[PDB]
Design a binder for this molecule. Structure first.
Ligand SMILES: Nc1ncnc2c1ncn2[C@@H]1O[C@H](COP(=O)(O)OP(=O)(O)OP(=O)(O)O)[C@@H](O)[C@H]1O
Ligand SMILES: Nc1ncnc2c1ncn2[C@@H]1O[C@H](COP(=O)(O)OP(=O)(O)O)[C@@H](O)[C@H]1O
Ligand SMILES: [Mg+2]
Ligand SMILES: [Mg+2]
Lengths: 70, 49, 502, 466
């Protein structure tokens, strides 16, 4: 069916004329890609784009031992 | 690999014999065991970027 | 995108005359097909919508066919085609590190598996000439298994017990523990593994691939998966397909291992599939040849001679039993195919012995006693010292006092019982096993308390891997524990016992 | 697209078409009745003839009576307006408050999720029951079963996990009744209206309801469980919430599937069940999942026939769970309520890295003392207590203080006995069992550990009797 071989490539080239993502999204693709974009961040964490690690650690304080001896 | 060795000091080190200060050494070796291998996995270097 | 367009130019639209049989009925998976003259038995037939099926019964009027999939796209009056091949699955090393369904299509989504050779699921076990006896060991890393109930390479060993006792965990510490040989250097100490999931929900098999990928265990296994949602002819075909990827290894040189989890769910997929083909029921409505179902499977687990390649194929079938009764129909038919067993119980699991192995009953035809040379020294005496314990240590009510006579021997058991307990997903090595077992049988623990031996073990084990690495390398290399190697260990246990509790 | 009735056996109506055979599991509409009668195609018996299973009663049908083809399976109206409404197997309002007006419709029959849409993340859902928090902790997103006979407590236990979890929940909720009695399905409407969960006047209601009870024909009980399972998937995949799901009872999906399997022409398997017992169960249970798009926290009550756990209908449900709460009869003859078997109940999150290594050692250490009381019941029953040692009169007296300290007064059971329902937190049970294992309360009697909440009531009940 090479007449069908040409007819699924030629209506693939029409999909390669794109402006803003989906062609017939409407309220469908706008809600779904925003529902999924939250879920990759919801149970994952709150993370910005480029912020480095900012913290500070304190070690164990070295106490002394009192000892009258001999 | 910044890491220090030591001597074999487990036998009489709990026998420090303070004024009934048995807990002073019996807690001392207890900190000594966990801190040894845990700081060994710190001391050498960080992995590849 | 360039990927969709290149997939559509590589597609071949070949057309030919088929051989074709009109459908007469479709209900509950069985499609009695009018027509189909030259069909074989066990041939794979292909419905119109993309489904696939296998023609089991031949008959003069109709042809019974069972479906690999779902029977709702199939309407009376459809078209059944002929492939021309008895049912075959792809095979190779290229399936390594994947999760696949029961016909070799990937359900992980890493893509198409590039496989080159195809092998039937109904091939024949090799006979009497091309085998040899069992020379090698297979290390599990469990300490109650490796010392007391050893398992050779090429020996069918049955893990049997109830639900939620340890049957899956026992066979997953075994998958993890071969990590140390697979990154080594010799090609004859490796062990490539295979797990077959029959009748399991996908929220257990997608969770076991997680446990097998943090420890990087998944780079040397395959997971053939037929979940509980699948068609009943897909849970029947799964162990015959998983066993046929095992025999790429064994028939080319290497050593394989295969776990059937479990084989009480490959039987109720044969009872249902062959009641709707109108075959008369036997006992418990099982068919006549459930013994022939399991026996033609568990005899491919060979150990070939060295003029064929010398490869091996171990097998570890799991069996779930009801209420711990071992005299049922499907248990006893598979006890008497396997060389040895591992009897997992419940009162061992709850009293505290975990892994809950009945070491009294866990018999094993020892596999030409390929335990290893050093473990023979310390677990030879352990086997007898534990057997001496079990005859005499079941009173729980004492009236008389014989500390010179009896209470010395039963103090050697509780030090060796509480030594045998283990954790989970952290399996040991064999020379780390010889060291910890040395300290138990040589009297070097009778002055402890039994509530401190599990604490004594990890402090001991961390001391020997850190400070004594060149010691343990002479046990693994030389095999045996030599007399000068007996000398060096005599101080280390006593030097550590001098400063253990302080 | 028309056809006539040919044969009628109970609830298996045969119907012959002339052209346009319906595909399997369509719906057929019987013309000439006062109510709606929908037939769902099951088989294809050869030469333009199907065999169907009917959703309502078949009395009054004659041969030749016309039958019309819908074109689609049983569809129900699904959406956010389904909350506070009661439905039946074909999705019609049986609350007499008028129609359900949604924008979309959902078929009853859909497939299962794939492999690569599973979520593995496990947590702990603290409930407030001591037997479940300590020994067998529930998860947040996993299936739970409550096995039990007849008269043990599988629904007083399910009325607690609503009273403790569905109040403090933030998302929605779905209840389903499959084959259990109808006055209990009326006291869930007049207890969720009074307590603000059903709002009759605006759109601030949380729970949905779906009902097919023990008066229906067995083509309805076999398909009512796939109905509440569909209203609890729109609230997962298309709205993205965290939904509960309570099913009672799920055995009648199977009991009423071996009543229409004899008449379809099938040889029976073991003790009387259908040949396909464990493929239709693995197609209903494989859709009740937590996935990457939402999370369903199932709680299913399961019945065991004639008090037998090796019967084929309960004993094939076990591979589909995460937690398990096997109840018992002989426990409940003593008075221990909730009569949970501490030795038969499991989890997959009881683990020292998940439940915390302090909790995991009070867990395994209290099973060890419980097994050792069971392993001497041969000798105590024949011989006596008085022929024991002194160490094993101290796993007997300590494991009778532990059995009694697993019975808790529930909130829903105040109306029975007149005792205040107690909720304990998690951290006050671990602390309260370490003081029975270490041996601090070995002077208090055993009548003081019984039917109390946190551990300070046990010393207070011991303070009363003197
Ligand atoms: N070595 C061990 N020590 C202590 N507990 C363990 C060990 N191995 C497994 N367990 C625990 O025992 C429980 C059951 O183990 P597992 O799931 O392997 O049993 P199973 O019989 O395979 O279950 P199923 O009956 O569902 O197949 C799990 O909760 C697991 O965490
Ligand atoms: N927590 C409890 N406390 C006291 N009595 C209970 C408790 N749970 C159940 N019961 C008793 O057991 C019976 C259980 O019946 P019910 O739970 O309604 O249905 P099922 O027969 O399915 O268990 C109740 O009528 C009640 O008398
Ligand atoms: Mg298992
Ligand atoms: Mg009930």
């Amino acid at each position: 069916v090479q007449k069908l071989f040409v007819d699924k490539i030629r209506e693939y080239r029409t999909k390669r004329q794109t402006s803003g993502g989906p062609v017939d999204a409407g309220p469908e693709y706008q809600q779904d890609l925003d529902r999924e974009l939250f879920k990759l961040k919801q149970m994952y964490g709150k993370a910005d784009m480029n912020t480095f690690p900012n913290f500070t650690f304190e070690d164990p304080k070295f106490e002394a031992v009192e000892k009258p001896q001999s | 690999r910044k890491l220090a060795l030591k001597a074999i000091d487990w036998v009489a080190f709990g026998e420090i014999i303070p004024r009934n200060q048995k807990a002073i050494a019996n807690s001392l070796k207890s900190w000594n065991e966990t801190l040894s291998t845990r700081l060994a996995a710190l001391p050498e270097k960080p992995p590849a970027i | 995108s360039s990927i969709l367009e290149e997939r559509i130019l590589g597609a071949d639209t070949s057309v030919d005359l088929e051989e074709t049989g009109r459908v007469l009925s479709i209900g509950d998976g069985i499609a009695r097909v009018h027509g189909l003259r030259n069909v074989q038995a066990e041939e794979m037939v292909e419905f119109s919508s993309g489904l696939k099926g296998m023609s089991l019964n031949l008959e003069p009027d109709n042809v019974g066919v069972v479906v690999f999939g779902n029977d709702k796209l199939i309407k009376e009056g459809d078209i059944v085609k002929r492939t021309g091949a008895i049912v075959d699955v792809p095979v190779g090393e290229e399936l390594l590190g994947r999760v696949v369904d029961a016909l070799g299509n990937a359900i992980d989504g890493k893509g198409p598996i590039g496989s080159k050779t195809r092998r039937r699921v109904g091939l024949k076990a090799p006979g009497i000439i091309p085998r040899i006896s069992v020379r090698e060991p297979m290390q599990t890393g469990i300490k109650a298994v490796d010392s007391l109930v050893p398992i050779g390479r090429g020996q069918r060993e049955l893990i049997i017990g109830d639900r939620q006792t340890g049957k899956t965990s026992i066979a997953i510490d075994t998958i993890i523990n071969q990590k140390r040989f697979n990154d080594g250097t010799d090609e004859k100490k490796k062990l490539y593994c295979i797990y077959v999931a029959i009748g399991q929900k996908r929220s257990t098999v997608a969770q076991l691939v997680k446990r097998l990928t943090d420890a990087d265990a998944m780079k040397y296994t395959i997971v053939v998966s037929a979940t509980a949602s699948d068609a009943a002819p897909l849970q029947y075909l799964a162990p015959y397909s998983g066993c046929s990827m095992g025999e790429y290894f064994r028939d080319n040189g290497k050593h394989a291992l295969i776990i059937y989890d479990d084989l009480s769910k490959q039987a109720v997929a044969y009872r249902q599939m062959s009641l709707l083909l109108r075959r008369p029921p036997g006992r418990e409505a099982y068919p006549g040849d459930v013994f022939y179902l399991h026996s033609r499977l568990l005899e491919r687990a060979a150990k070939m001679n060295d003029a064929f390649g010398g490869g091996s194929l171990t097998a570890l079938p799991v069996i779930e039993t009801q209420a711990g009764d071992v005299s049922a129909y499907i248990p006893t038919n598979v006890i008497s195919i396997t060389d040895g067993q591992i009897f997992l119980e419940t009162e061992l699991f709850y009293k505290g012995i975990r892994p809950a192995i009945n070491v009294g009953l866990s018999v094993s035809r020892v596999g030409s006693a390929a335990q290893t040379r050093a473990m023979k020294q310390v677990a030879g005496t352990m086997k007898l010292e534990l057997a001496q314990y079990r005859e005499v240590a079941a009173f729980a009510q004492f009236g008389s006092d014989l500390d010179a006579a009896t209470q010395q021997l039963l103090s050697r058991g509780v030090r060796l019982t509480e030594l045998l307990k283990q954790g989970q997903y952290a399996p040991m090595a064999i020379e780390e096993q010889v060291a910890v077992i040395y300290a138990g049988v040589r009297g070097y623990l009778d002055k402890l308390e039994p509530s401190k031996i599990t604490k004594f073990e990890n402090a001991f084990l961390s001391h020997v891997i850190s400070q004594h690495q060149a010691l343990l390398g002479k046990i693994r290399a030389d095999g045996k524990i030599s007399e000068e190697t007996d000398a060096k260990l005599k101080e280390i246990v006593t030097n550590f016992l001098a400063g253990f509790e302080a | 697209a028309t056809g006539r009735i040919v044969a009628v056996i109970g609830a298996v109506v045969d119907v012959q078409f002339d052209e346009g055979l319906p595909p399997i599991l369509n719906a057929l509409e019987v013309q000439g009745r006062e109510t709606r009668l929908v037939l769902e195609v099951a088989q294809h018996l050869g030469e333009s003839t199907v065999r169907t299973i009917a959703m309502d009663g078949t009395e009054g049908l004659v041969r030749g009576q016309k039958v019309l083809d819908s074109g689609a399976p049983i569809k129900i109206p699904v959406g956010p307006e389904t909350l506070g409404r009661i439905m039946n197997v074909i999705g019609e309002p049986i609350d007499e408050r008028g129609p359900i007006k949604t924008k979309q419709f959902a078929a009853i029959h859909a497939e299962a999720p794939e492999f690569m849409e599973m979520s593995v993340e496990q947590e702990i859902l603290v409930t407030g029951i001591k037997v479940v928090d300590l020994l067998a902790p529930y998860a947040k997103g996993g299936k739970i079963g409550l096995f039990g006979g007849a008269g043990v407590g599988k629904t007083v236990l399910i009325m607690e996990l609503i009273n403790n979890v569905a109040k403090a929940h933030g998302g929605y909720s779905v209840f389903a009744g499959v084959g259990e009695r109808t006055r209990e399905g009326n006291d869930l409407y007049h207890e969720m209206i009074e307590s603000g969960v059903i709002n009759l006047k605006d759109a601030t209601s949380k729970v949905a309801l779906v009902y097919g009870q023990m008066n229906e024909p067995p083509g309805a009980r076999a398909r009512v469980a796939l109905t509440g399972l569909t209203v609890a998937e729109y609230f997962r995949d298309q709205e993205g919430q965290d939904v509960l799901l309570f099913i009672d009872n799920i055995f009648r999906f199977t009991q009423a599937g071996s009543e229409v399997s004899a008449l379809l022409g099938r040889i029976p398997s073991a003790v009387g069940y259908q040949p396909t017992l464990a493929t239709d169960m693995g197609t209903m249970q494989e859709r009740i999942t937590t996935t990457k798009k939402g999370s369903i926290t199932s709680v299913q009550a399961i019945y065991v026939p004639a008090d037998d756990l090796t019967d084929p209908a309960p004993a094939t449900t076990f591979a589909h769970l995460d937690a398990t709460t096997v109840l018992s009869r002989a426990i409940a003859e003593l008075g221990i309520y909730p009569a949970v078997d501490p030795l038969d109940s499991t989890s997959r999150i009881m683990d020292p890295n998940i439940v915390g290594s302090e909790h995991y050692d009070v867990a395994r250490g209290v099973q060890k003392i419980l097994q050792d009381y069971k392993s001497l019941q041969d000798i105590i029953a024949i011989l006596g207590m008085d022929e024991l040692s002194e160490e094993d009169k101290l796993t007997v007296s300590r494991a009778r203080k532990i059995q009694r300290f697993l019975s808790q007064p529930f909130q829903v059971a105040e109306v029975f006995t007149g005792h205040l329902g107690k909720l304990v937190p998690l951290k006050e049970t671990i602390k309260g069992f370490q003081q029975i294992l270490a041996g601090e309360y070995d002077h208090l009697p055993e009548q003081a550990f019984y039917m109390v909440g946190p551990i300070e009531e046990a010393v207070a009940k011991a303070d009363k009797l003197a």
